[PDB]
Amino acid sequence: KALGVALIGTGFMGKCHAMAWRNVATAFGGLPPRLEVLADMPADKAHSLASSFGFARGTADWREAVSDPAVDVVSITTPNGLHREMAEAALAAGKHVWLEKPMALSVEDAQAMEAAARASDRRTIIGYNYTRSPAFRAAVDLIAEGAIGRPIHFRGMYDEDYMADPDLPWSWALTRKDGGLGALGDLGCHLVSVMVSLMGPVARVYAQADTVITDRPHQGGTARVENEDQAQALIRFASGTSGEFSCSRVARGYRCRLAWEVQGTEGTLRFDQERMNELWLYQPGRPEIDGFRRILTGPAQPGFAAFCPGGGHNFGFNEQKVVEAEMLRQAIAGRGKAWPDFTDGLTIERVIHGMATSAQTGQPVNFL
Amino acid sequence: ALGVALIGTGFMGKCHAMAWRNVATAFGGLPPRLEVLADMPADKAHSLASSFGFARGTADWREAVSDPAVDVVSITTPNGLHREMAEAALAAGKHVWLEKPMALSVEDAQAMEAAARASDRRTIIGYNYTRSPAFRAAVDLIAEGAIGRPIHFRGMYDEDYMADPDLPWSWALTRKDGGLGALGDLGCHLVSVMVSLMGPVARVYAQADTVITDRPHQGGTARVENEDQAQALIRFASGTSGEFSCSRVARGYRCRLAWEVQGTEGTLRFDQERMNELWLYQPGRPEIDGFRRILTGPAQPGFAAFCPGGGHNFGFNEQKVVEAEMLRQAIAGRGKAWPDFTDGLTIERVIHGMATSAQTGQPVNF
Amino acid sequence: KALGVALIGTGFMGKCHAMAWRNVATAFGGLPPRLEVLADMPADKAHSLASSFGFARGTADWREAVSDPAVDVVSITTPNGLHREMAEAALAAGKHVWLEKPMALSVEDAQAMEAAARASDRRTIIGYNYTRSPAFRAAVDLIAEGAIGRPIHFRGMYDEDYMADPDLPWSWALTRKDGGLGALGDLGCHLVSVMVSLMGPVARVYAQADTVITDRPHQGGTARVENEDQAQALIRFASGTSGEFSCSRVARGYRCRLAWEVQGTEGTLRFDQERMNELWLYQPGRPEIDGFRRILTGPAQPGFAAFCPGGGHNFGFNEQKVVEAEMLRQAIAGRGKAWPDFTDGLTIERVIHGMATSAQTGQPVNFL
Amino acid sequence: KALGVALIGTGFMGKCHAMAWRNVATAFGGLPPRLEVLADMPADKAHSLASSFGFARGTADWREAVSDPAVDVVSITTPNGLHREMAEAALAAGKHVWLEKPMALSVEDAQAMEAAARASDRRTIIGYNYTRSPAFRAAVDLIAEGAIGRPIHFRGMYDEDYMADPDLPWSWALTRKDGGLGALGDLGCHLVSVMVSLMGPVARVYAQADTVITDRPHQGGTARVENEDQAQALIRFASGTSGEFSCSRVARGYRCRLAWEVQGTEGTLRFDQERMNELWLYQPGRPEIDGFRRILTGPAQPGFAAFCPGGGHNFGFNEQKVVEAEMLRQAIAGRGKAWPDFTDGLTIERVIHGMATSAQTGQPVNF
């Protein structure tokens, strides 16, 4: 009863999934998942990485990975443009699916995938790995327990500078048709996954966006950048509470600055993913000792004890994916719900596309 | 020497008194003459005139402003009294150092702006967060192209002085007698910093909330009418984007005026709770690439007048000594003071525009 | 042709070694090591953890694991008092050894193990995993490149609070005979491993030490704490350069505070393991922009690109052990020297034991 | 009945004292001290700075300032080699003395000054201004209240880089005869003032020291730096508790890094003067919220409310000196004892000179 695993793609997220599947039973116990099929192109790369990743075989044929009888679950980590075709084929073949974010390039493709997931009766989860840190999970539990009273404001950002260099060449990812959203698709969807986990569903957005580098080098000429480098939005949650939201792929000096804070009637929680082992908690205290606490990640926080019994031994980015794999393992076993599945993921896609629509039309966008 | 009248002795009154006393110590020239202190009641004016070193105390602010030995008036009274006192001081031909915000309404600020122009006297408003060496260094770095072209501003001003729901109701929490809430107490400060970094505001879209809607009032409750918190998206006259917020109920924050300017070639970041640090990112070789912590010292504007050695932390109160020197130099015709009542009216239009936007659910253009 | 692995112990370090062996080829390439035998007591635990760790078999007899013909390298993660017996048996059986720190309870035992390692033509490495972070390795390279000129001062500390609470029960680890050193053995050896890597060898120490909680709950009575809760030393390096050194197991609020700085003639480097992804570098700059740089760990630093292509995705404590495994793998393949081996480890044992002696006699101890 | 003030020197500390005397009554109430005589050289500089500082007159003659009948108290902010002559003259003239640190160049000098202060029956205070921050004073009160349980370790450092540049010229401050100690005299004495205020008296030190830049430019040539650029020491307190101690004037990137922590059996306090408005306090808490608190300086802390009613409005370095002035003012009025006076200051001189002796001889020094 070991879970049979297929992996499609071996890049940033492909290798991250491979490391997660390899150690999920080391951390959490039970039977090690069997690493059956690795799909990647070209074939010589799939063969080489299948060998070093410990997959029983590599193939250049992604459909082989979704249709092998020894496969129960498929990790899909290919470019956004391929997610709908590969996820639907995996569900149609009766496989559980771990799909990297975002779901697809459009709300329409995500809607089709959401319907296909319901029809398949298989488990799905989307790769929102910033919801998996012990610090983030600890913050959600502290809010649930009334540690900061009633939330009254959310402020969140996700700054990186991977596109700040204007000489970085044009690519398909910078077109609407083949790339979908820009910073909202690469980073915004992550901040939404964290924001709605803390504050509940979004009822309304009003957004602005900018393209800072509007044209890029392309084969001796230049081509237009058609999606946003940065976006900001004001939020009304279904609770009526306010929010501030931003993302940027051109924010110089920032590498993984997913940073958020929840202000409540009885305290404040604050976090920055660049220091993912620290959670700042303010609660009213006597005047002589009053102030924010630095909570350093350790075994009191969800998931941490599976990796290390001693506090302050920093939890890493890649271990978030081991926690994500375990949540999908337990969901497949009927011992837990995985979040977000394709239904909860579709809502996230509607929010980021709603922000893009609001920025273009200059109108607030309402949900439900 | 400049003859000084001071009206009020509270948070800002005592801050102005300390500033007028040491402005020549820091910057040279003749010490201003501390001529008349006005406060109520008379006993308190006489007591604080003695300890603050003013030649006399009065309970009559009107005769304080009319005194021929007075050249300049510090006005540190509640918001509702700013218009009457500033107009009376300008009418008596005195220069005016007025605390923020200008008044309760744009209408009031417009009348004050007209009176200031008609008086041919110098005015400055108490936007003291524009006076830190770190802030002034950041403006100079942007002017030198240290971060290329600004592409985004993000600013906040969080405090928690009204977070306790048991704090009593006051006339400050009514629209008619209090004006704006967090936008008037804190928002105006963040605007003074934001437009100094990014230039004028073209458009705002705002949201606001009253978080604690009823407070204790005489064994009963009374309704809070103005906002505890407000947020806005900004479009600058330059076409650049901004994020803006303020709050008087943000638990754990005491003076968190924090801002960030992201440019095409770097980033500047600041937090007033650590007012001696300026964070600068510029691209560097990969082995050493990262933000620099610039600790305030004599390389930054104003610091060397207070201390010859870097890392000896500059204080909130010393911002007011810099503010006094800027007014002194304006009065001597050796510098232009910012913001005067004309510059100040623009800031009033922005915070009232944010309030209007939050009420209507519509953007406001300037 | 893949390395055959035996693992003895399954605790804090046992599980850390198991996760390292499982992902070393995922991160760095080549053939995944074969997880052949896991040894632990009792046998039921050995069989259970062999299953979840992915070892081919579990045994309650460690001697039988180190003699297995399918085993080439032995990870020893057992308590300090068993290190000598198990390392000597593994070397005698012709196996390479990955030994957890400290080497043993006494210099006498470390001396015997060092002679054994040498008598064998097998590779050894000791688990000084704080020398493996990208930030630390980056700092060593910056010093060698002259980024801070000549070191003029070292200041290092290693504070934790795992024994700070007077309520915490007595254990055999708090006796000289069965526990060996206190804070110097648990934490001090780690700080020495980092300090001599930055500054070069120790020539002289003058030390103080204290047992600050002298008795602890034991069987409804109390028992005496015999070894040190904290120790501090002034250092002279062979270079002539000065140092400050401390460790503590009773330092309230600290969880993994291995923190050090190197002050040089042309700059300063500063590091804190509780924020293991930040390296602080000061070099003189023009007055308007002069200040320390926060270098955030990313692919420019040694080892990081094997785990993640994007900077600011925090490297974790456990990933230090994957780097350590790779260094031992490459040393076994004859394509790099592993540090520290049992010879370099014996020097570290002599330094911490010299500090303990200096504190006891009130006299400096010389090593050269 | 206003206190009459003489100020000797107008440099870093002279101007800091001038600003403190000017606003001490503004902050704390009572009668503003009268700024009577400022002494500095040359005369035109004394006249110009007396005018801008608000002193009734300037003179080039420090003895004129000390002897003026309108003067009750003398601020002495001159170089270390002049402290003894000027302090003894002020005490002999019947004036209270606010003396900058360190007291003098030698223990022998400090002993003579300590005797002169007792004979004069005048108040003395030494300018250990880092003991005056609201954060420091709050930490001392928290330790006394048992907030960290029993102290078990002190670790303190004081790093600056004002001499890190080898091209900074030689001065008489860098000879032992005319300059006394190096980093131990400039910074070490400050760290001792904070350390003994937290941990009580020092019983034993073992120290090491180095001169990193042994020769400096002198009038186109070179001259020898005779005193230490950095020093480190292990401490035993009279309590039996351990300490670590260091100072440096060549620690690149540090500007005012007086940083200390006290570890106790029920908590830890930690502070860094470069962020002088933050005090870090760890006390045990339930595991879900356990961690250090950032205490931001505000009106709950000693002295702060005299300057500002609102927390988080950063208290400045210069306002430490306004607090120091107030402590001396109250001591003169018989309404409080000022610390350290020349008797408590002599003990601090013995500790820093004992560290220098320990570093020179390679032997521990007992007190």
Ligand SMILES: NC(=O)C1=CN([C@@H]2O[C@H](COP(=O)(O)OP(=O)(O)OC[C@H]3O[C@@H](n4cnc5c(N)ncnc54)[C@H](O)[C@@H]3O)[C@@H](O)[C@H]2O)C=CC1
């Ligand atoms: N959760 C997270 O933090 C992160 C998620 N991602 C997501 O990972 C996904 C991939 O990222 P990208 O930058 O687009 O590319 P990438 O190069 O990082 O990975 C794409 C992988 O898919 C393989 N591939 C491409 N076409 C294929 C085909 N037809 N059959 C089999 N394999 C194929 C490539 O060879 C490569 O191994 C995206 O959905 C992206 O949004 C990326 C970075 C971080």
Ligand SMILES: NC(=O)C1=CN([C@@H]2O[C@H](COP(=O)(O)OP(=O)(O)OC[C@H]3O[C@@H](n4cnc5c(N)ncnc54)[C@H](O)[C@@H]3O)[C@@H](O)[C@H]2O)C=CC1
């Ligand atoms: N720039 C800044 O950072 C700050 C500015 N302020 C501003 O300062 C002004 C006053 O607020 P605070 O100083 O906090 O209030 P406060 O209550 O501390 O001081 C008000 C002073 O005005 C006096 N006063 C009232 N009515 C008077 C009258 N008819 N004649 C003479 N004196 C009178 C009061 O007795 C008191 O001394 C406000 O406009 C406020 O917005 C306040 C705090 C900080």
Ligand SMILES: NC(=O)C1=CN([C@@H]2O[C@H](COP(=O)(O)OP(=O)(O)OC[C@H]3O[C@@H](n4cnc5c(N)ncnc54)[C@H](O)[C@@H]3O)[C@@H](O)[C@H]2O)C=CC1
């Ligand atoms: N490098 C580092 O960062 C760290 C190193 N260590 C070191 O790791 C070693 C073990 O400490 P922990 O892992 O914390 O202890 P632990 O109690 O968590 O693990 C000890 C393991 O050895 C096993 N064991 C004991 N006797 C055995 C026997 N006769 N045969 C087979 N297995 C046996 C135990 O069942 C247990 O699995 C120590 O040498 C310690 O100094 C510990 C923590 C961190």
Ligand SMILES: NC(=O)C1=CN([C@@H]2O[C@H](COP(=O)(O)OP(=O)(O)OC[C@H]3O[C@@H](n4cnc5c(N)ncnc54)[C@H](O)[C@@H]3O)[C@@H](O)[C@H]2O)C=CC1
């Ligand atoms: N407590 C603190 O934080 C600080 C204390 N200090 C102390 O302040 C004192 C002065 O500092 P330095 O660096 O030596 O010099 P400095 O140049 O900062 O100040 C010396 C002042 O004394 C004046 N002076 C020199 N000889 C004089 C004489 N014969 N008569 C009248 N005035 C004379 C100088 O013109 C100058 O105004 C020293 O004792 C030093 O330790 C210095 C900096 C900070």
Ligand SMILES: O=C1O[C@@H](CO)[C@H](O)[C@@H](O)[C@@H]1O
């Ligand atoms: O999903 C992501 O997108 C990458 C860029 O495509 C970012 O670098 C990652 O930090 C982020 O996790």
Ligand SMILES: O=C1O[C@@H](CO)[C@H](O)[C@@H](O)[C@@H]1O
């Ligand atoms: O203008 C201000 O208003 C006060 C509230 O009334 C805030 O506490 C101050 O920080 C701020 O400078």
Ligand SMILES: O=C1O[C@@H](CO)[C@H](O)[C@@H](O)[C@@H]1O
């Ligand atoms: O080797 C170690 O010893 C443990 C205690 O035994 C500490 O908690 C660890 O941080 C350290 O790595």
Ligand SMILES: O=C1O[C@@H](CO)[C@H](O)[C@@H](O)[C@@H]1O
């Ligand atoms: O007393 C002091 O000595 C100066 C050096 O002379 C340092 O720069 C100051 O920070 C220190 O307070």
